[PDB]
Design an enzyme around this catalytic site. Sequence first.
Site, PDB file in Angstrom:
ATOM      1  N   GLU A 151      15.146   7.795   9.788  1.00 53.66           N
ATOM      2  CA  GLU A 151      13.856   8.682   9.865  1.00 53.66           C
ATOM      3  C   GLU A 151      13.022   9.225  10.685  1.00 53.66           C
ATOM      4  O   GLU A 151      12.456   8.210  11.426  1.00 53.66           O
ATOM      5  CB  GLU A 151      13.238   7.956   8.793  1.00 53.66           C
ATOM      6  N   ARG A 170       4.766  -4.017   6.884  1.00 53.41           N
ATOM      7  CA  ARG A 170       3.910  -3.196   7.210  1.00 53.41           C
ATOM      8  C   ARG A 170       3.207  -2.998   7.051  1.00 53.41           C
ATOM      9  O   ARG A 170       2.129  -2.950   5.460  1.00 53.41           O
ATOM     10  CB  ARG A 170       5.026  -2.190   5.887  1.00 53.41           C
ATOM     11  N   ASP A 206      13.918   2.371  -4.599  1.00 47.70           N
ATOM     12  CA  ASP A 206      14.840   3.371  -4.494  1.00 47.70           C
ATOM     13  C   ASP A 206      15.795   3.309  -5.721  1.00 47.70           C
ATOM     14  O   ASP A 206      16.456   2.483  -6.421  1.00 47.70           O
ATOM     15  CB  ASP A 206      14.624   2.844  -3.075  1.00 47.70           C
ATOM     16  N   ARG A 210       6.655   6.560  -4.345  1.00 47.74           N
ATOM     17  CA  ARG A 210       6.497   6.193  -3.124  1.00 47.74           C
ATOM     18  C   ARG A 210       6.510   8.147  -2.729  1.00 47.74           C
ATOM     19  O   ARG A 210       7.085   8.138  -3.129  1.00 47.74           O
ATOM     20  CB  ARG A 210       6.680   5.392  -2.858  1.00 47.74           C
ATOM     21  N   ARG A 245      12.803   6.318  13.300  1.00 48.95           N
ATOM     22  CA  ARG A 245      13.078   4.511  13.113  1.00 48.95           C
ATOM     23  C   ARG A 245      13.975   4.748  13.416  1.00 48.95           C
ATOM     24  O   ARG A 245      14.755   4.644  12.742  1.00 48.95           O
ATOM     25  CB  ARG A 245      12.612   4.755  11.572  1.00 48.95           C
ATOM     26  N   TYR A 278       5.197   3.924   4.624  1.00 49.40           N
ATOM     27  CA  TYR A 278       5.390   5.183   4.849  1.00 49.40           C
ATOM     28  C   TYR A 278       4.367   5.777   4.861  1.00 49.40           C
ATOM     29  O   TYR A 278       3.225   5.734   3.971  1.00 49.40           O
ATOM     30  CB  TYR A 278       6.270   6.189   3.488  1.00 49.40           C
TER      31      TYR A 278
END
Length: 658
Positions: free
Chosen positions: A503, A581, A232, A207, A519, A615
């Site tokens: 971000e 997304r 994460d 990622r 963001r 991303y």
Amino acid sequence: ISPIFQGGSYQLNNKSIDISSLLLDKLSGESQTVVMKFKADKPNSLQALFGLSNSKAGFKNNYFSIFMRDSGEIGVEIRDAQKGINYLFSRPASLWGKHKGQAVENTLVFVSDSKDKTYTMYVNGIEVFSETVDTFLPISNINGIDKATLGAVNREGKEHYLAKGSIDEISLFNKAISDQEVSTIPLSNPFQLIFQSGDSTQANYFRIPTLYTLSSGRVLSSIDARYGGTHDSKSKINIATSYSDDNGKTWSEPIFAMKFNDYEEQLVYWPRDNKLKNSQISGSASFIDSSIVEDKKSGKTILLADVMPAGIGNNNANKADSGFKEINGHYYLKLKKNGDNDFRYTVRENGVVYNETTNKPTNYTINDKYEVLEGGKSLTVEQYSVDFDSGSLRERHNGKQVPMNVFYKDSLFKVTPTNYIAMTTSQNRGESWEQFKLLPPFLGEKHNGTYLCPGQGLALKSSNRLIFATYTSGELTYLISDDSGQTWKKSSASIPFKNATAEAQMVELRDGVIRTFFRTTTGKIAYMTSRDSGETWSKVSYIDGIQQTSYGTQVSAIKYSQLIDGKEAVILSTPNSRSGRKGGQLVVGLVNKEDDSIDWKYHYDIDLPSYGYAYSAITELPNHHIGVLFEKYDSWSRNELHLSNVVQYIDLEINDLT
Ligand SMILES: O=S(=O)(O)CCNCc1cccc(Cl)c1
């Protein structure tokens, strides 16, 4: 061997094609392989590409199908009511739809192997599932099969799962072909993999891609190599890098820029079922979120990432503690010894571990690798490995000793359980990386540190200035260096959200004029502007014409070197969608020299609006093409966790975007 059936140029326009007479009596034995080259740039919500079924009344649940969803998910069903078998195997985000506005030919290989009792699906050279069962059901062993169908499944005489698309080629084999044979099958991929399952990282997942064009023409990429699924931290994650010396055509075998050894680097298939998918490697230190920049002056490449001690994510990260003690303008890393309830030590100059309660130094020191030494001798801890053999996740010692690190669970001295930022450098443009150093606190002794914005830092064209954006609650905190990253200062820029994942990525519009896109929690991308090379920052504005979700997604951005329609241009990469997304775009903006406003003039759809895009990383390649490395799936969705080979790379030309 040879196909028992081969056909092509089938148009699926919401009407099934019967190939029963051509195929059914060619099927024999219990093992089969389906090879199918197909396009679907306007799929229905749920559609079957291929079906074998009992079409008779009362047998609606006796069929085999290969189906897809307009989310990009691929799967099979294998069903026989008499046998009491209802198999459903699938994986989200397995397909391409369009590339440069042209329908992509997907190459699908499905292997049904009676000997190993295993069904395996490959799409575009990527294994997306491999399922072993106790009771195998050969696909043509289904009770009463009397139809072979393209673009639907015939159930009780009616067309279910009607398809829109085409099958340019389809072959069937009365054999389960080998993994080796599969890899010889020609592909028509619109993308490339830089990082991938089975490479030198030995991470099954990736990622947070980055891309950066170095002055020699080398393009460098960094990424989260994620071991414990796509979670994460807490998890095990290293930061890996690869470079291309031929404008992105080929890429080097990855190496690590930042790695920990407290847990073994293991390629693990993380469970995707609802009971176990939230299993999380819980006792490992980890890195997360990397950012790259190049320094003209020294020629060094500089990479930063967040660092997390064992067990620690952003949820259990000690807010209200930087992890450093202030002792007269200087910051020293705090430590806690095995047995104490408080942090009674600090790492003073030359890594000397120093007892704060008695102000005496100890015989313990910390080396450059944050490893613990006693009397100059290297202490060790036993490594951990993980497995799901017992049914649930187990983390256990594996017999191997590794250097004792203050970020580790089993360490005699432990850092504060919070988030830090590390920096490493390369002198050889990413062929090797130095041991990282922690950056100091910027917001004070008792403020937990900021979060690095993943992607690129900014190297100002007309000076030696380097800047990395970071975020914390209520502000962007730009880190600024004018001396090749030896020393940093902060520049705070307030934003109107508390606890946002802000971000941020920067472009230089012209000398000393920086625009930062970031963001937010508002469903719109925000921006602010500096006109003094990052010393001070404007108020926040928002972009119209692009939508994000309430929780938002990272946005990547570059200043294009060439004029477009006679104007200076900036290119943004982002999902364009208020739902999830997906709907990836590159948006080209032309700058208005009067006021530095930006007319967002061209939207380029990366793939379908319904296909995943999260991303991303964008860079202007040395030939003026655009390189894009991106998460080709929904990395927020709880249904698309732990997917392999979805971070993918594409090459575009500016004429493609306009
Ligand atoms: O928007 S996402 O949820 O896909 C990714 C958000 N990452 C934020 C973060 C940064 C540092 C450490 C941790 Cl643990 C989490």
